[PDB]
Each structure stands twice: as C-alpha cells, then as structure tokens.
Design an enzyme around this catalytic site. Sequence first.
Site, mmCIF file in Angstrom:
data_model
loop_
_atom_site.group_PDB
_atom_site.id
_atom_site.type_symbol
_atom_site.label_atom_id
_atom_site.label_comp_id
_atom_site.label_asym_id
_atom_site.label_seq_id
_atom_site.Cartn_x
_atom_site.Cartn_y
_atom_site.Cartn_z
ATOM 1 N N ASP A 28 -5.795 0.964 -33.878
ATOM 2 C CA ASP A 28 -5.647 -0.148 -32.948
ATOM 3 C C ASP A 28 -4.687 0.322 -31.852
ATOM 4 O OD1 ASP A 28 -2.939 -0.548 -33.971
ATOM 5 O OD2 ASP A 28 -3.806 -1.778 -35.556
ATOM 6 N N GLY A 58 -1.801 -1.123 -30.926
ATOM 7 C CA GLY A 58 -0.410 -1.403 -31.243
ATOM 8 C C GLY A 58 0.221 -2.653 -30.651
ATOM 9 N N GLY A 59 -0.369 -3.185 -29.583
ATOM 10 C CA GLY A 59 0.168 -4.371 -28.934
ATOM 11 C C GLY A 59 0.163 -5.648 -29.759
ATOM 12 N N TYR A 60 -0.856 -5.813 -30.602
ATOM 13 C CA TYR A 60 -0.993 -6.998 -31.452
ATOM 14 C C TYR A 60 0.136 -7.134 -32.469
ATOM 15 C CZ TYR A 60 -3.117 -10.415 -34.701
ATOM 16 O OH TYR A 60 -3.394 -11.499 -35.508
ATOM 17 N N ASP A 74 -4.802 -4.082 -25.117
ATOM 18 C CA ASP A 74 -5.004 -5.413 -24.563
ATOM 19 C C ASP A 74 -3.834 -6.349 -24.839
ATOM 20 O OD1 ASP A 74 -5.331 -5.889 -27.323
ATOM 21 O OD2 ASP A 74 -7.094 -7.140 -27.082
ATOM 22 N N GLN A 124 -11.929 -10.694 -24.635
ATOM 23 C CA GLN A 124 -10.953 -11.770 -24.823
ATOM 24 C C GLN A 124 -11.535 -13.035 -24.210
ATOM 25 O OE1 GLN A 124 -8.335 -11.924 -26.616
ATOM 26 N NE2 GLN A 124 -8.003 -9.768 -27.118
ATOM 27 N N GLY A 136 -9.172 -11.830 -30.200
ATOM 28 C CA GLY A 136 -8.699 -13.196 -30.059
ATOM 29 C C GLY A 136 -9.166 -14.208 -31.084
ATOM 30 N N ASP A 157 -12.458 -5.179 -40.321
ATOM 31 C CA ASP A 157 -11.232 -4.614 -40.860
ATOM 32 C C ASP A 157 -10.325 -5.790 -41.216
ATOM 33 O OD1 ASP A 157 -10.091 -5.019 -37.891
ATOM 34 O OD2 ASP A 157 -8.399 -4.511 -39.176
ATOM 35 N N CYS A 203 -19.374 -5.666 -61.000
ATOM 36 C CA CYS A 203 -18.739 -4.600 -60.230
ATOM 37 C C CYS A 203 -18.926 -3.217 -60.854
ATOM 38 C CB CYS A 203 -17.249 -4.898 -60.049
ATOM 39 S SG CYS A 203 -16.407 -3.722 -58.991
ATOM 40 N N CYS A 218 -17.095 -0.545 -59.854
ATOM 41 C CA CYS A 218 -15.878 0.241 -59.674
ATOM 42 C C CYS A 218 -15.290 0.769 -60.980
ATOM 43 C CB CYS A 218 -14.831 -0.538 -58.860
ATOM 44 S SG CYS A 218 -13.587 -1.460 -59.810
ATOM 45 N N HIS A 246 -10.190 -2.111 -57.045
ATOM 46 C CA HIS A 246 -11.291 -3.016 -57.321
ATOM 47 C C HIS A 246 -11.686 -3.814 -56.081
ATOM 48 C CE1 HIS A 246 -13.720 -6.311 -58.803
ATOM 49 N NE2 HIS A 246 -12.873 -7.104 -58.174
HETATM 50 N N1 LIG Z 1 -7.502 -11.176 -35.439
HETATM 51 C C1 LIG Z 1 -7.446 -10.556 -34.089
HETATM 52 C C2 LIG Z 1 -6.868 -9.190 -33.890
HETATM 53 C C3 LIG Z 1 -6.410 -8.399 -34.847
HETATM 54 N N2 LIG Z 1 -5.991 -7.300 -34.315
HETATM 55 C C4 LIG Z 1 -6.141 -7.300 -33.023
HETATM 56 N N3 LIG Z 1 -5.800 -6.268 -32.041
HETATM 57 C C5 LIG Z 1 -6.025 -6.455 -30.774
HETATM 58 N N4 LIG Z 1 -5.725 -5.559 -29.894
HETATM 59 N N5 LIG Z 1 -6.602 -7.637 -30.326
HETATM 60 C C6 LIG Z 1 -6.950 -8.653 -31.183
HETATM 61 O O1 LIG Z 1 -7.452 -9.696 -30.820
HETATM 62 C C7 LIG Z 1 -6.688 -8.453 -32.630
HETATM 63 ZN ZN LIG Z 2 -14.364 -3.652 -59.978
#
Ligand SMILES: NCc1c[nH]c2nc(N)[nH]c(=O)c12
Ligand SMILES: [Zn+2]
Lengths: 372, 372
Positions: free
Chosen positions: A92, A94-96, A146, A193, A220, A270, A308, A310, A339
Amino acid sequence: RPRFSFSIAAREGKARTGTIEMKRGVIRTPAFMPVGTAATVKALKPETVRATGADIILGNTYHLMLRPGAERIAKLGGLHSFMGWDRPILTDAGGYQVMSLSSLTKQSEEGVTFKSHLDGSRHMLSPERSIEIQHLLGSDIVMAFDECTPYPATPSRAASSMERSMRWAKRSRDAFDSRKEQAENAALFGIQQGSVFENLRQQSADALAEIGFDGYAVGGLAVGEGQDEMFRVLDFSVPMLPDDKPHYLMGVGKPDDIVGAVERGIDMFDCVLPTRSGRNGQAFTWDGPINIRNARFSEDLKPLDSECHCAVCQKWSRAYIHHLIRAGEILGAMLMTEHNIAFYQQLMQKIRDSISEGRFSQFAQDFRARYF
Amino acid sequence: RPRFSFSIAAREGKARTGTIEMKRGVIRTPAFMPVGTAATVKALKPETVRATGADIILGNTYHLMLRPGAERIAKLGGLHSFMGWDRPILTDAGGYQVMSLSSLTKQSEEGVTFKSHLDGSRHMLSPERSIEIQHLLGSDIVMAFDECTPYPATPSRAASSMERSMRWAKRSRDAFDSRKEQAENAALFGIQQGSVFENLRQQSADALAEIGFDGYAVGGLAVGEGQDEMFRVLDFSVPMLPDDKPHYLMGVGKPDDIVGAVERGIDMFDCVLPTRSGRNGQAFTWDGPINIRNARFSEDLKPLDSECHCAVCQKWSRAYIHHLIRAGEILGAMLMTEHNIAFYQQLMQKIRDSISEGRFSQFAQDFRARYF
Ligand SMILES: NCc1c[nH]c2nc(N)[nH]c(=O)c12
Ligand SMILES: [Zn+2]
Ligand SMILES: NCc1c[nH]c2nc(N)[nH]c(=O)c12
Ligand SMILES: [Zn+2]
C-alpha cells in the site's frame, strides 16, 4: 513471465475469474491477499502462507518505513529476500495508516508530515516518496499514494479529497515511470475515491483511466458505512473502471463481503480479519465463525471446520486449540491463523471454480444459507 | 519395542552413549528433552520439534493438572493425542512447580496442599495422586513424587527432606505397580536427593536402588549452587547410581553444563533455557550465545549460526530475526526457538558421535575453547 498480464478466463454476471501473470508468479483471481504488516504474516512462516494457497501477500509501507526502514530493507536485498517470500507482493502507499496510527499529521498538497507512534520521530510522505519507498522494498504491485475520505463525508469534502487524490495519482504515475527498473519490473494500481457519491466516483474513474494504470482499486469503502451501503456503492462504481484490468477492493475481508464484492466485479481483496481475529480466538467455518475460547469447545474433539483441508484441521481438535488460546500460548495463534487463512483461500478457490463452471450465483446462495 | 530397554553402545570415561527403547519410540542418549509446559513446546508445532531431532519431550504435571486438567486430557484421549506428539513423553511429578508457583503450600507427610496461581483454587498432590495424574496424561516415563531441598540447606534439613523423598519414592513405586496398564506400558524413574552432602546422596542412592527403578534422576541440583559445586556433587553422586540404568539430571540446560554433566555420567537432560531465552532474544551459537536484539545485528545478513543445519539458518538472516524480535512479532519467537532447540539437538548429536568414536574429551575441550 511478463511484467504484468491480466486475462479473464471466465465470467458470470459481473463476476470474473482469471489470472495475473507477473515476473515473480501467477495470481489467480478472484484473489485474497494475506497481510504481512511488519515484514511478516503474523504467526506464520512464508512457506505456510504459500501452503494455504496464497499467490500474493500485502506489505504495509507505513510500518516498514518506520521499522526496519525502507533504505535498510533495500540494503539487505529487498523485502522478498528479507522475509523469505519469493512471490508477488502488493504494497500500500502508507498514507492510510498515517491518518490513523501517527500524530502531528500536518497535511498539504505536497503530502503528509507525521510523528511515529513507536518513537515520536518526524516523517514526510508524498506521492514521490511513497513510490520510492515501495521501490526500495522491491514491491511487485505498487499502489498510488492517495488521501482517504472519512465516513461520513459531505459532497464538498469528498470532492476535494477525490480531486487531490487524482492529482496525486498523476504524480504517482510519473514518479513510477521515471524509475526505469520499477516501471519495467513492477505494476502500478490507481485508487478510485469519491466516498458514496456516484458523480464523484465517475469523475475519479475517468481521471484514473485517462492517466492509465495496470489495475484499479476501489478506495474509501469499508470505513464504517455498512455492507448494504458498500454494496450499493460497488454496484455503480465497479462498472466505471476499465473492464480489462483488475479491480481491487481495499480492506474488505468478511467472507460474506468477499462473495458480494465478487458478484459486483471485484478481483482482489486484502484484510487483517483472518489473521487478527485468528489470534483473538475467532475461527471461520462454513457454518459461520465461532469463538474457540467459548467453554462449549473445551472437550470438542472435532476439527475447527468439518470440511476444511488445512493441516490444522487434519491434526488438532477444537479442544486443544481452545486450551492453547485460553492459555495464551503462541501455538494457539499459529494454528488459528493458519486455519483462517487456509479457509479464506478455500473460499477464493470455490469462488474461482464456480465462476469457471457458471454456477457462482448458486454457490453464493448456498454459501449464505449455511454461513448465516 | 519393549516397555523399556536401556543399552549402552559405547563409553569413554564416565560418559556413555546408547539408546532407550520404549513402546512409542527410541531415545538416543545422551538426550536433551524440550519442555512442553502446558501441552506445547512454546512456539513450535510438534512436527517441528521432531524435525530438530528430539526423540522425547517433557510435560509439566503441575501446569496440566490445573489447565486443562488431567481427567479432561484423559477423556480427550491422553496427552499424545491431545497435543499431536506420538513419541515418548517424560512427565515430572508436579511438586517442584508447586513449591514455587502456587500459594498456601501446606506441606505434610501425605503430600502438599496449594492454591493455583491462575485461579486461586485448592489442590492436593501426593505420591499416589501424582502417579495417577501422570497415568491420566498417558506419560511414558513417570517421575516419582519427591520433595526438593532449597539451596543452601543444612545437613539436618537436607537429611529430613531426602528421607521423606525416599519414603515417597516407595509410595510412588507401589502406586505405579498397582496400576496394571501403567506398569506394563510406562517406565518409572526415582529421584536422588541429599543436597550437596555425600553421605546423604549415598543413602538416597541405596534406598532408590533397593526399591528399584527404570531410571535414576539426580535431583536437587541447578538450584543456585553454581557449576563448580554442581559438578563437584555429580562427581561423587552419579557413580552411586546403578550403572546399567539411565542417569537423568533435572533442570540443567546450559550447553556447557550439559557437556560437563555427560563427562560425569549423565544420560538425560531437560531445561526451558533454549525455548525461554529463545523468545527473549538469546540465540545459541558455537561461538557462544548472542542476543539478537543488539543493534549490531540490524544489518547482519549471516544466519544465527554459521554451521547450524536448522531450517531457520538455511532461510533467514540475523537482521530479519533481529527485526522480528524487536517488533515483538510471533514469527520472531518461532524462529529463535526452532533454532535454539535444533542447536541443542546438534550438540547432543556431536556428543553421542564423539563418545561412539572415543574422542569425547577432545570434543569437550574444543567445544569449550570456541564457545568461551
Ligand atoms: N478500507 C479502505 C482502505 C484500506 N486501505 C486503504 N489504502 C488506501 N490508500 N486507500 C483506501 O481507501 C484504503
Ligand atoms: Zn482448517
Ligand atoms: N533443577 C532441579 C529440578 C528441576 N525439576 C525438578 N523436579 C523434581 N521433582 N526434583 C528436582 O530436584 C527438580
Ligand atoms: Zn540454526
């Protein structure tokens, strides 16, 4: 393999199943990516993460820039080499995590300035710095930097944040392209966004497509709006994104949200839910989640889940894992996490298979009936 | 295999190397037994414990009687089935942990009464109850219930505690024998007491041999007396025990103590040091221990140990494990623990091999030179 190649093998409604070929490996979509916050998928060796069926993992840029540092990781050979995962890694920007983990957060058109939670140190993060950090980490799928929009948001604030994100998307694109090695070996995803507003989501999608990216995330969402609202937004938002590129829903992980999101055109997911709740005592089953700490499992010899495949469900009982978790034992977290991630990968497999066979709507219907 | 069979294949001075055949497996001696306190060798799956080379593990009776309970474990199928370890398991009698982990400790000739540290509940433990609990656990090597002597101890108090332990040794023997299934499938070890006094150690050894046991432990050591004193006591104490039966030194685990103890006739060892210090940041190497948390390892790409054959040293660097430990990551504990236990098993292997080849004194000499 090529730098990046996304091909759709089958469809059913808005759902798609296919693959993303990258230099480090193939990613089967719809895909669920386990989160490896500080260079580790909590309580699991990378070989175990792979054994569960994961084709790619996510790495948190915010956490890694603080400890052990991006430059340090680069000197050590990159993130793959550092943690022992040789397959694709999506990072990602990193801003979030900055907007909710650090202090000082002085925001501007150039980026964000902040104080680390574990040291109180000063750090600057901009579209250029973010792209550079992800490069130093050796990231395969780089996320554009973002500015997220807090829920709820007024049309005015959502418009301003979205417009800024689009300017930052252009800066991320140019930064990524200026670094030869990165543009040639990695991929760049843009982030849509616009909060819950349709016209804003459309403007965002148009700006992103204009710039051009390898993939498109729907940002978002999953910020407190609820499933009904999230689904309502996905209904009109996903169709706005280029159809021939992957659609990534950030921070969405409840099994039921995943199924609904795939039905709406999402290809990648994720979330920390499987890992986090795993260590907390929550185990996912086809009959819905259960909290293994509950006393009714103290002498239950059955595996976490009856179906399962696993390793945990093949070797240990609910009673043992119940004991481990209540005793605060590390093995308790290891087993619960393995698991849960395996359960998630099995969910993605059943999704990919049903779409390929044109029986996904029925799978979703059957899944819900039993899960709820 | 037989219920119990100890055979000495080679000797050098007081050192011996051989095997103990039991129904669940073969134990190569000298042996080091990893400790699985609450039905788990902390941070390791039992398959990983086996992968390091362990032939047998130890289970704490005191902890298991409290949580999840002996009767519960029996109902669930026994400890082996419960934790997933199908090889031999040696269980202590539980009294040693009572004298320093619980409250109320009302001692008498019948046994000990105490309050649990995690609940404040009331429990009684006697030679008979101890043997029964170990039976319920499905223990392979049952330890006689004894009364340890605090260091330092006066000749009078050591004599009284030793004499009581010998009476309790007789009670443990009779209890063990009265339970058909246990006497036929498990083994019973007696424990020598007598503090640091020779005449007392001799009386204890004579009483134990008179009763007759499958193995003999040297108890009351590693309780604050120091290596010099411990070795001095072992010099005259081990020769007093029956030569054709295993000699077990309880709670001794520093690599250097192990080597010295084997030179004095000890065949079995157990200690939490490798596991405990593993999670604390201490990694054992042939060049002596190192604390991976130290800043000098932040960018050290070398494995924990340059010669170690463990999976950790084959895949991860000191820099990565340094990061993991300083970040409080679960994987940090998993990796450190696996390496330490593997290092210990490699130490036992080098000991067994050198004795078999008649070059153990030289190995001990070389080991010390480099380790210190
Ligand atoms: N659940 C939203 C979210 C998780 N991580 C994120 N990272 C960024 N840059 N923007 C986003 O909107 C989100
Ligand atoms: Zn399992
Ligand atoms: N270090 C000594 C020791 C550890 N555990 C023990 N358990 C018993 N019963 N007796 C002992 O002397 C000891
Ligand atoms: Zn090693």
